[PDB]
Amino acid sequence: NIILDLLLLLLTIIYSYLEALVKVFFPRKRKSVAGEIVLITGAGHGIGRWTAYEFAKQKSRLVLWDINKHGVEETAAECRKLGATVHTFVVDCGNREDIYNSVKQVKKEVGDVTILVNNAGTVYPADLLSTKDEEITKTFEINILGHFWITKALLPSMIKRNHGHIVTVASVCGHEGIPYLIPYCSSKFAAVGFHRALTLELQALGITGIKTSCLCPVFVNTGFTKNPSTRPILETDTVARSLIDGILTNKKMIFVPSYYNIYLILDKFLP
Amino acid sequence: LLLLLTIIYSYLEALVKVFFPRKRKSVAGEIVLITGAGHGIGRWTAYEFAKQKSRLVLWDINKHGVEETAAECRKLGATVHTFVVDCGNREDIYNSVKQVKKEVGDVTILVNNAGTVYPADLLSTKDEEITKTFEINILGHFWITKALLPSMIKRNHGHIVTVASVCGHEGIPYLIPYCSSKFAAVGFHRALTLELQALGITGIKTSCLCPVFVNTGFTKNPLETDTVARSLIDGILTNKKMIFVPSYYNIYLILDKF
Ligand SMILES: NC(=O)c1ccc[n+]([C@@H]2O[C@H](COP(=O)([O-])OP(=O)(O)OC[C@H]3O[C@@H](n4cnc5c(N)ncnc54)[C@H](O)[C@@H]3O)[C@@H](O)[C@H]2O)c1
Ligand SMILES: NC(=O)c1ccc[n+]([C@@H]2O[C@H](COP(=O)([O-])OP(=O)(O)OC[C@H]3O[C@@H](n4cnc5c(N)ncnc54)[C@H](O)[C@@H]3O)[C@@H](O)[C@H]2O)c1
Ligand SMILES: O=C(NC[C@]1(O)CC[C@H](COc2ccccc2F)CC1)c1ccc(O)c(F)c1
Ligand SMILES: O=C(NC[C@]1(O)CC[C@H](COc2ccccc2F)CC1)c1ccc(O)c(F)c1
């Protein structure tokens, strides 16, 4: 217990310092996203909202979607103060029909989205037998099925121009199971799979201009879930910074904190 | 290079399997519910359970195919009950669980095998088919497990078998909706294992079957059915959590993480 704490803590410093060393010695080049049409779902609060702020500083043209009218317009007001041109829409990102109709409006009002951030998410923590079936369905409808309908609507223009970036906001819950989050983990594993199979298909289809990134943070202080009872302290602006740095550098799998990948590599060796 | 790692891992495993073997439990007299048992993996898994002397509950939307499996199981000496159930339909699942309870009793081993696939690139897929894929390959696992888990918990004895794929571990072009639904099946199994553990439920075991392509006619040809059914039964009896078919496929998965 004292031995395994000091063992993994040393690697939380070893992997982290090794990465910050390679990041200066052999760096990945940063692209520009200025003037790109960025659509962010769940832009009304938390990660989506702070990702919208990063894109506003990057000089992108923003399209913000959310079911919360007040929340998304509040993010847009901050983005406009940052100097960005912003369009907001009230869209249920778990509703296939609402998504398609809103994509026609985005096309007519702004133009063709070049960067899609599938951020909107839901969760109803409970043990399997305490979950409501309506909750399981909502979780899948928003966390994964919505990613299909939005990507399918926006991908044809990106393919035609051979230029785009599909950003999947998953979780470390898409890599490991967590108790009381069975429907949620399952939907997040589905998001990781969509990103992986999408990357491989574009490659197989000879589509070189469309990039893919998958954001996998640990618990974040956004109010999305109730703070763990007794238990890595992660703030919203840190996650939004990690995501923007990942997108600009065309990084496929963005773990937040980046060192979290050692636990994932370790699990693939355990008895 | 990789052809050698395949022979090395395979022979290392067959060596440990005789030197330090896992003990095999009995499933004789257990009430085993197998979904999509009207053909392929589910059918040949039903045959393995019939030889194991289990009581069988076979579900499928293919009535003729499921009664054909049942006839073979009965020849093998097993008692078998068949039901025509859409394992992607929540209402049909719940009503059928009422009928299973009234006619057979409490299921102790659940095999979530029923599955669907519509190969096509993302932009060629039909939205109705993406929904069907999720409804059957994962959402159905929630409704069936939720219905059958309460009796297993009460008795602290059960086994939840998730039939996923290597597609639940790696992405495949032309199988985006399918891979996504299979990743969801792997995640359900992983989070379910960890939750039972956290809740102090020691008697309920979990296994996840992840085969590569199998010659069942599930998809057009780019591993035989009886081989997969044998691997699954050997995995269940030995309480193995992750059953890759072929078992050596795990080296490619360990390699991808580097
Ligand atoms: N918070 C964490 O601990 C954590 C960790 C890892 C990953 N994530 C993921 O990050 C994403 C954003 O979560 P967050 O922590 O910023 O949460 P949040 O509660 O701060 O905000 C999520 C936003 O999504 C919106 N939304 C919900 N349902 C929607 C729908 N049907 N249509 C449109 N918008 C909808 C909400 O209105 C809200 O503004 C989610 O996909 C979540 O699963 C969160
Ligand atoms: N065949 C492969 O290459 C392969 C590889 C890995 C995993 N798998 C998985 O193995 C499982 C079984 O596939 P298979 O290869 O034996 O296919 P199969 O075609 O031989 O049979 C699948 C069975 O599922 C039944 N089914 C389909 N929809 C159903 C529904 N709504 N309700 C009830 N039953 C339903 C079908 O009637 C059929 O009998 C699936 O979960 C599949 O995804 C298959
Ligand atoms: O950890 C996240 N939230 C915190 C919770 O809200 C509260 C704690 C429970 C886990 O509780 C236990 C775990 C193991 C044993 C016993 C527990 F009780 C998960 C939900 C969380 C939620 C979304 C994410 O996307 C994410 F990465 C992390
Ligand atoms: O491999 C399985 N089926 C085979 C196909 O039926 C036919 C080939 C395509 C993949 O094609 C390509 C992949 C990469 C590059 C170029 C391709 F053309 C998948 C579907 C298969 C199907 C279910 C499973 O569960 C599984 F594990 C495997």
Residue numbers in the entry:
A (entry chain B): 2 to 232, 235 to 274
B (entry chain A): 8 to 229, 237 to 272
Which sentences did the original study use to describe this structure?
Hydroxysteroid 17-beta-dehydrogenase 13 (HSD17B13) is a hepatic lipid droplet-associated enzyme that is upregulated in patients with non-alcoholic fatty liver disease. Recently, there have been several reports that predicted loss of function variants in HSD17B13 protect against the progression of steatosis to non-alcoholic steatohepatitis with fibrosis and hepatocellular carcinoma. Here we report crystal structures of full length HSD17B13 in complex with its NAD+ cofactor, and with lipid/detergent molecules and small molecule inhibitors from two distinct series in the ligand binding pocket. The overall structure of each HSD17B13 subunit could be divided into two parts: (i) the catalytic core domain (residues 29–259) that contained the cofactor binding site and the catalytic center and (ii) the membrane anchoring domain that consisted of the N-terminal helix (N2-P28) which was highly hydrophobic and a C-terminal proximal helix-turn-helix motif (P260-N286) which formed an amphipathic patch on the protein surface.
Subsequent mutation of four residues (G177, V178, T205, and I293) identified at the compound 1 binding site of dog HSD17B13 to the human ones (E177, G178, A205, and V293, dog mutant) further improved the resolution of these crystals (compound 1-Dog mutant). The overall structure of the compound 1 complex with dog mutant HSD17B13 did not have large changes in the catalytic cores of the HSD17B13 dimer compared to the apo HSD17B13 structure (0.31 Å for 437 Cα atoms of the dimer). Compound 1 bound to both subunits of the dog mutant HSD17B13, displacing the C-terminal peptides from the substrate sites of both subunits. Missing the anchoring to the substrate sites from the C-terminal peptides, the adjacent P274-N286 helices in the helix-turn-helix motifs became disordered. Compound 1 binding also rearranged the P218-T239 loops, which interacted with the C-terminal peptides in the apo structure. Within the loop P229-L237 peptides became disordered, and the side chain of F220 adopted a different rotamer. The combined effects of G177E and V178G mutations made an outward shift of the 177-180 peptide away from the ligand, leaving more space at the active site of the mutated dog HSD17B13 for inhibitors and substrates. As a result, 1 had full occupancies in both HSD17B13 subunits in the crystal of the mutant dog protein. Dog mutant HSD17B13 bound compound 1 strongly, and only slightly less than the human HSD17B13 (dog mutant HSD1713/compound 1 Tagg: 46.8 ± 2.2 °C; human HSD17B13/compound 1 Tagg: 49.1 ± 2.0 °C; unpaired t test p = 0.016), indicating that the mutations introduced in dog HSD17B13 based on compound 1 interactions increased its binding affinity. All of the residues interacting with 1 were from one subunit, except A205 (human sequence), which was from the second subunit of the HSD17B13 dimer.
